[PDB]
Amino acid sequence: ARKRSHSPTKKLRYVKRRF
Amino acid sequence: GTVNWSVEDIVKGINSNNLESQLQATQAARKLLSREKQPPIDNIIRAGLIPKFVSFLGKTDCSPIQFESAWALTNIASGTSEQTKAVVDGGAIPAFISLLASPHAHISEQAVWALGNIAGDGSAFRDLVIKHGAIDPLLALLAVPDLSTLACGYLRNLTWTLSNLCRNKNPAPPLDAVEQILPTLVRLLHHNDPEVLADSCWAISYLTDGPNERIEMVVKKGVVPQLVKLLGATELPIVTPALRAIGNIVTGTDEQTQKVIDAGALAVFPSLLTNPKTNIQKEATWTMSNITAGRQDQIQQVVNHGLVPFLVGVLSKADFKTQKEAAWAITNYTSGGTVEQIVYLVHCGIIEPLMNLLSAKDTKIIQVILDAISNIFQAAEKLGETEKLSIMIEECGGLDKIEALQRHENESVYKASLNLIEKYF
């Protein structure tokens, strides 16, 4: 039994606009 | 005044050598780029306005134009990766870093926001922001005796930008940068604002999503107890990242997992494994699966906390992905557990749901279930009770499913089913 790491995120960019 | 300007008028105002006309045109640009629907970022870039905005970032004697251009560039960098690249190509990174030390708090906050966008583009721009020397002034902005003296929005923006500096892999952030950031990140992890807490937990989750050395860097700062406390929070935006961080930490060594267990994490999992939000259930079952892959004493602590029945419940009814995580947890349990722990597993009623899941179409879950059944049969062999387990599986209807899988397309499923039927049926 081996530790299983989390799957890669598909959210590659995290940006925010100021409204 | 400065509302609903055309890009033509903005360009004419910014091309004038009247700093006040330039200021009003820059404010009009900001208002265009701050509109709810389809801001005209591409047109603004095609007009060639980014170099002018970046030049305005350095107008110390006109703080209003600094602020307006910082806002405009922030919103441009919030677009596609090509538009963030356009901002970076104009030289905006060092100008924003210089503005971090502005005596005007709103200008410094806007610079923080812009650097957050740039670093959030990806790992290359993250590392480039780090190379220009943003971490030191960013952290200096947070070097106060009590975080509660800072404006809430300012603090949230700083936390989000730091989290972006901790985000992304291939490559992960530089080790020296992580070590420089971590103390402030722990301090923020102890703050009382829900958004600051959520973003700090997300940053810790980023930092723990890697090799065991990265996990050790974080756990040696003493974050695990606070992470468990936040795992028990009522706000889902806090519980989600806290659970992600705890899971990442238990993907590491047995001692780091033991640090998670010692902090009291397991006592929260009765709720997490029954949480109405499916993502929480899935992540909690994945965390439990990595905890059952640990030592036999850690499996025993899983048992003592009464969590095996909750695994049986998730295996019985849940979304299929959570059921797959639960199957993995069961297979790890049976691979690493004692005979007594395995017979306890069987006494809790695992066989029937584990067999009902052999109906699925996914080949990997079928292989995982068949491996778990083989392990349970090896335990029963060591007890001489193979026939009782076979009778149980037959009454459940599992023998039908296994003999059917003998005809499965995948080789491993075929051979495992035939081995089970030849050896025990």
Author numbering:
A (entry chain B): 21 to 39
B (entry chain A): 72 to 496
Q: Anything the authors wrote about it?
A:
The MERS-CoV ORF4b protein is a viral accessory protein that functions as an innate immune inhibitor and strongly localizes to the nucleus, despite virus replication occurring exclusively within the cytoplasmic compartment. The MERS-CoV ORF4b protein has been shown to bind preferentially to the nuclear import adapter IMPα3 in infected cells, thereby inhibiting NF-κB-dependent innate immune responses. Here we provide a detailed, structural basis for the interaction between MERS-CoV ORF4b and its innate immune suppression target, the nuclear import adapter IMPα. Our results provide a detailed structural basis that explains how a virus can target the IMPα nuclear import adapter to impair immunity, and illustrate how small mutations in ORF4b, like those found in closely related coronaviruses such as HKU5, change the IMPα binding mechanism.
Because the results indicated that MERS-CoV ORF4b NLS was able to bind IMPα isoforms with high affinity and showed little preference for a specific isoform, we examined the molecular interface with two IMPα isoforms using high-resolution structural approaches. E Crystal structure of MERS-CoV ORF4b NLS bound to IMPα2 at 2.1 Å resolution. Strikingly, the binding interface of both structures lacked a Lys at the P2 position within the major site that is seen with other NLSs. Surprisingly, MERS ORF4b does not contain a Lys at the P2 site, but rather a Val (position 35), which did not form any interactions with the Gly150, Thr155, and Asp192 pocket. Rather, MERS ORF4b bound IMPα2 and IMPα3 through an Arg residue (position 33, the equivalent of the P0 position) at this site and formed similar interactions to those made by a Lys NZ nitrogen at the P2 site.
